[PDB]
Design a protein around this ligand. Structure first.
Ligand SMILES: CC(=O)n1cc(N(C(=O)c2cccc(C(F)(F)F)c2)c2cc(O)ccc2C)c2ccccc21
Length: 116
């Protein structure tokens, strides 16, 4: 509260660290469904059903232009990619499995990088 402040972590490297994690995501062989925005003109249903589309290239653009206030807002957008994927894809499909794999991959790197 006012004048009562928690000792707060050094957030100086967060921008660089998030960029590194995003690069690792993008180079994963199962990243291909997520590298570019879903084509809203070519995929029936997607625009109407998925209220907040997100993909790795859009996250990169947001990250590089100072549009994430903090690392938590970055994590939310990454998770949104996989939540959208779950909403629109059967678990028993290539993209369905890709989404599962990539979420697991992310969460470990997230834990390994930031939870001391
Ligand atoms: C995440 C997710 O659920 N999906 C992603 C899809 N997808 C496209 O919409 C897409 C976008 C641009 C070009 C191309 C193409 F070059 F392949 F034609 C495909 C996609 C497909 C790919 O093979 C590779 C990359 C992307 C972004 C997509 C398509 C249908 C249903 C869910 C989808």
């Amino acid at each position: 509260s006012m004048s009562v402040k928690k000792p707060k972590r050094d957030d100086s490297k967060d921008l660089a660290l998030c960029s590194m994690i995003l690069t690792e995501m993008e180079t994963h062989e199962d990243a291909w469904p997520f590298l570019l925005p879903v084509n809203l003109k070519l995929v029936p249903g997607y625009k109407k059903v998925i209220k907040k589309p997100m993909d790795f290239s859009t996250i990169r653009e947001k990250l590089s232009s100072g549009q994430y206030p903090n690392l938590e807002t970055f994590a939310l957008d990454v998770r949104l990619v996989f939540d959208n994927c779950e909403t629109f894809n059967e678990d028993d499909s290539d993209i369905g499995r890709a989404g599962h794999n990539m979420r697991k991959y992310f969460e470990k790197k997230w834990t390994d990088t930031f939870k001391v």
